[PDB]
Design a protein around this ligand. Structure first.
Ligand code: 7OQ
Ligand code: 7OQ
Ligand code: CA
Lengths: 706, 703
């Protein structure tokens, strides 16, 4: 039951390369495509920039009449002649370091002020940032679609053309996020007001949930400024729910317009979130797509992976991202829409010997397809570069089509993939550990993020102590997920929203990283999980509130837990491990009733217990740890061993990472050395040892038959 | 001309290793010391924690009466028996992940509220954070000194003991930096009031500078909250000046107490500022010691270098720090008081093969001595660790004195240093480029920093557009200095404060990264520099204000410059380089009378000129660039070549870094490969070599 791309009823590993026809001498297009095809790639991918093709208002060139590199039609025909399928991405936004993020200069000069994204003061956030549902923006976007979409429709696979997939716009919300400010455009504020009225029906029902005293819906304003009251937190939480409906409305309007041209190819979107070589904020960005992914089972999201280097400093980012995409999109293959090749930034180097290891690690970490971004360097024509004349460096081909060092790395990886794809695509890893993904902890991009200008959320002003962003970044992403990968314990991630109990019962352990708040549905689901036979690990808090910070003690009551919150030293003992550094002075102190106490404060008060409940097992730790000391890995190891979970291999060097992937025919062992040390080690299957030497920042792959 | 440590009247490379006796089984103290000596190290360094030796109020154990590892006397005796010099660091603060940052629990329980650093509301900032000038704190510090300083005094080299240097406290001001919170203890604020009265004399004089409306000094309150007005900026600027005097007053009280015991050895302090493997904030921390460095020629500041890894991502950090320290401390050797060995953080790996390259790069980059921190891992006694049981990982030795991978790297590097030190220590680089260090741009630790979550400085609210922290981090540290190092052009840094004109005339170019504000003394210095024959490169602004944001147009008027500030596309052309991305829409558009236009907006307005002024040359660019594109390296290269400055070598691979260090007799060529690529190249003076990833090669040439 792996999800993978299919060609002609067989597993197909999607290998694409990004080649920007608009940034390459058209006399050299065929050579770029030939050299991409010779790496074993089956697809080529490109933006079709609106600014490049609508050269003035209502003046379109797709044929090279005004500039040879405007000859889109020729580029499509060459893709077909060179036996490559094509991914097209006509925007309206492309980003792509193209001036004005791809929008025509003539359009941005003509639009009225009310087309732009606006701050709470009514000021333009950025002269190239439109409001997505601006009437004026969508009118011109539709006139662009009227010209580019008939060309895309004509050249679809079903009409014997090369076009197999199309991206809608580009990384929806990426500008809101990087600008560090949210959109208060009056189109947006009016849709928000309709959303609130639809959700609550009467001002009395809203007031009962928020604890506000409004006389009418007319008194309610879009939340702005810092959160000081639980009522401000409630208003912002609904504002987050509203933006997820808003982005779903935007993509819905583009999709409906596209389908009217007879375009039946696969539609895609692309997920932002890596910055400075780590992806700890990507889960927040993927959370902004929650309503798109529920409403559009036919739009496949892929990841935009930008590792920059490949070391222990970022080894956990790509696996945690691939797992979280699978959790939110379990019916489609995990794929990278943009899979780092070379570097966007001259000063931020991308070494072939790093990216080659990233590519192999991505296979170990369950990737099923990717688009090398950028396969071909470009030169910006006509001053169209946002930041300088050259587009990307250290790619597979330079802009002239010369092979660079990365070319042989990509050929090596592609060769292995083509040899193995029939088995490799069908392989699974045996995960006995499931980690819960509780989307509401991620809904903070308006109030708390690595990129937001103003920190609007301070939980201590709300009488709370567990910050949801600290929890999801340090206790979950950089803590538990980093620790399991480092310890070589396989895990899966599951979305807790509308989660079937039967999709949890296959695991030996469910791990829940909990704040003081959790909705009644999720508190009930976890209660039933344990009563019915599940083994639950829960920390750092039993929640006592719902998503609106109103009382909800369902899980606490169903588990027969009594506790008080007390201050103590950061250090606790747990399972006989002394001096376990914890994030908070405040801890939950549990009554010892019908339980085994397994963690103790410096005053020897009980801050963790284990108990049997119905047919299940509960382990609660009333303290927070991520992975900032060796004791944290010893603790994760102790917790995993409570249900006798074993690693697949005994490996003599604990700093070697491995993944075993297998199906009925084939076993693949991936060894990953994320460290600057030549390592010699030995290993054997958990149920005569082989010796292996591995270079710094390198990999080995062993195939076994049966 | 070079500054360096000396032993037996000859150049001595100071090689120290940090070994915490209080964190190591005393049965193994001799084995740690023997293994340290066997790497070629000459010195061992440790804290002497106040909490560890004053076990209860007025109960001192330096002999291991109450715990074997309190036997400081025995550890000192062993250093001498094992032929190691000793650096001691008795605090009172040690940090060192030691509970309460080294202060005794009994002390923190007993101190009155007014001994603590307080927020603006009079609340204790942190239960282990004292006010440095608290009468009660200094009294207890003095009683600690009365017990530990006679021991240190007796064991000086002078008395054929091992002790050669002592550190005073530890990273003074580090807690104000990491929190972004200033101490508003009423004793501190009374000292601030005295500082302001001393500076301005009369309320009329302060009102004229600040544009305030006070009737007397009684109206004046310590600044707090966000800067909304130019008068708030002025008050915060003087609050930064005050803290530099305050730290000088604290270290002076400790120094005078220490000297009273006949302690005549070298006194040290240590400079923080690395975080996550880069050091772009460390110049801000250096700037907090301006008054100490002016008033104490005999206190040697060393750097705390924490690179974490070694690559092109952070290659420029250690050179820029070493150059800025030399600018502010020209009469002492540049040395690392804490020189990364292993890692403080289990999850933040320190590879032997990375740190070996860091140690060699540090030699290329002018370091004259260092203390491997941590040479030996520690185990925290009886939960005295702030964090877990273990102190550091991937060190040279584990806490049990097991050799680890880094041991053989340090022995290798130390063997090279000992072989070359007599000649290597006497070498300098030939810099024809001078880069100005304007300290007031750095005086922001209370209002604008990488660590400060909520920014108190927003220059747009003051009618400005060039933020001094953006300028000093992106345009200077990660832009010009990174670019010059990448291009293999030598530079020196000079402190512009009280700067001698004759020191600037050795250089072919002086580079000044300028905001809209610059004091009259510095505007006059740069005016005289050009009129006398100097070549000045000045960007992104001709300044028109002084440090209090009052009109000052001395440089503008002396150079016959006129400009209007106008908005345009971010991209400009300069010296025929198209598509140069600049930081701001706002640019200076220059009148070009008597000038040559050399940079243009997208609409061809003049945003850069060259000019002859007296006997000298002016290049003014009205736009800001760092290093974020290949065009930025092209522009720096063109600017350097305006005065015919040449690299010392032709090296066939432009991504190889080199440093040529020479004296009259000896030349060293350091080749540094900061890239994950085996590179093969050739070199010649303005021959074919292979260097591993993240590695080095050193060539000697006799002259
Ligand atoms: O690195 C921050 C983000 O950077 C984005 O790139 C940009 C590059 C330039 C720009 O002006 C805005 C965005 C990527 O598309 C996204 O995947 C990534 O998460
Ligand atoms: O990494 C930030 C700083 O961390 C400092 O260590 C500390 C870490 C935490 C803390 O609360 C106090 C000090 C280092 O001594 C200093 O050199 C460094 O620049
Ligand atoms: Ca003039």
């Amino acid at each position: 039951s792996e999800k993978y791309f299919v060609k002609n009823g067989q597993p197909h590993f999607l290998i694409s390369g990004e080649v920007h026809y608009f940034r390459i001498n058209p006399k050299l297009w065929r050579n770029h495509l030939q050299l991409l095809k010779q790496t074993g790639a089956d697809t080529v991918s490109t933006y079709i920039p609106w600014d490049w093709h609508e050269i003035e208002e209502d003046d379109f060139d797709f044929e090279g009449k005004t500039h040879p590199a405007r000859n889109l039609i020729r580029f499509i025909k060459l893709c077909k002649e060179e036996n490559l399928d094509l991914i097209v991405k006509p925007g309206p936004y492309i980003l792509a370091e193209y001036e004005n993020q791809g929008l025509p200069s003539w359009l941005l000069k003509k639009l009225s002020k009310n087309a732009f994204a606006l701050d709470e003061n009514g000021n333009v956030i950025s002269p190239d940032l439109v409001s997505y549902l601006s009437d004026e923006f969508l009118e011109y976007t539709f006139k662009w679609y009227d010209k580019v979409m008939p060309i895309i429709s004509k050249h679809q696979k079903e009409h014997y053309g090369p076009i197999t997939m199309m991206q809608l716009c580009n990384e929806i919300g990426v500008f809101q996020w990087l600008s560090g400010k949210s959109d208060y455009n009056p189109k947006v504020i009016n849709l928000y007001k309709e959303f609130i009225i639809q959700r609550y029906k009467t001002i009395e029902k809203l007031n009962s949930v928020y604890s506000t005293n409004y006389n009418s819906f007319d008194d309610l304003k879009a939340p702005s400024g810092k959160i000081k009251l639980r009522s401000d937190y409630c208003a912002y939480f609904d504002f987050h729910l509203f933006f997820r409906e808003y982005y779903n409305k935007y993509i819905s309007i583009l999709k409906n317009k596209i389908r009217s041209f007879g375009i039946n190819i696969k539609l895609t979107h692309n997920i932002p979130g890596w910055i400075y070589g780590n992806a700890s904020e990507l889960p927040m960005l993927i959370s902004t797509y929650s309503e798109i992914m529920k409403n559009h089972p036919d739009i496949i999201f892929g990841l935009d992976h930008i590792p920059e280097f490949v070391s222990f400093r970022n080894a956990h980012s790509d696996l945690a991202c691939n797992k979280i995409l699978e959790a939110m999109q379990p019916e489609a293959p995990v794929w990278a829409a943009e899979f780092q090749a070379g570097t966007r930034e001259h000063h931020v180097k991308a070494y072939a010997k790093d990216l080659e290891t990233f590519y192999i690690a991505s296979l170990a970490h369950g990737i099923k397809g990717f688009n090398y971004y950028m396969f071909s360097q470009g030169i910006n024509p006509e001053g169209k570069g946002f930041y300088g004349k050259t587009f990307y460096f250290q790619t597979a081909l330079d802009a002239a089509s010369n092979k660079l060092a990365l070319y042989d790395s990509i050929k090596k990886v592609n060769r292995f993939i083509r040899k193995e794809q029939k088995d490799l695509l069908r392989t699974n890893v045996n995960s006995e550990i499931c980690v819960g993904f509780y989307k509401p902890y991620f809904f903070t991009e308006l109030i708390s993020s690595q990129l937001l200008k103003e920190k609007k959320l301070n939980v201590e002003e709300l009488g709370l102590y567990i910050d949801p962003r600290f929890l999801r970044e340090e206790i979950l992403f950089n803590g538990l997920l980093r620790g399991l990968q480092t310890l070589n314990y396989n895990y899966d991630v599951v979305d807790l929203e509308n989660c079937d109990l039967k999709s949890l019962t296959a695991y030996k352990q469910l791990w829940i990283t909990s704040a003081e708040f959790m909705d009644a549905e999720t508190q009930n689901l976890l209660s039933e999980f344990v009563l019915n036979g599940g083994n639950l690990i829960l920390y750092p808090a039993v929640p006592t509130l719902d998503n609106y910070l109103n009382r909800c003690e369902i899980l606490k009551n169903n588990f027969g837990i009594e506790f008080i919150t007390k201050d103590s030293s950061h250090k606790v003992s747990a399972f006989g491990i002394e001096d376990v550094f914890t994030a908070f002075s405040k801890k939950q102190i549990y009554n010892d009733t019908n339980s085994k106490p397994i963690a103790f404060t410096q005053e020897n008060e009980i801050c963790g217990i284990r108990k049997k409940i119905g047919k299940g097992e509960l382990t609660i730790l009333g303290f927070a740890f991520g992975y900032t000391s060796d004791e944290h890995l010893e603790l994760i190891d102790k917790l995993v061993k409570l249900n006798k979970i074993k690693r697949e291999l005994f490996v003599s060097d604990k700093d070697i990472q491995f993944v075993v992937r297998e199906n009925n025919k084939s076993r693949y062992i991936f060894f990953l050395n994320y460290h600057n040390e030549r390592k010699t080690f030995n290993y054997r299957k958990s149920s005569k040892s082989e010796e292996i030497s591995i270079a710094p920042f390198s990999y080995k792959v062993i195939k076994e038959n049966k």
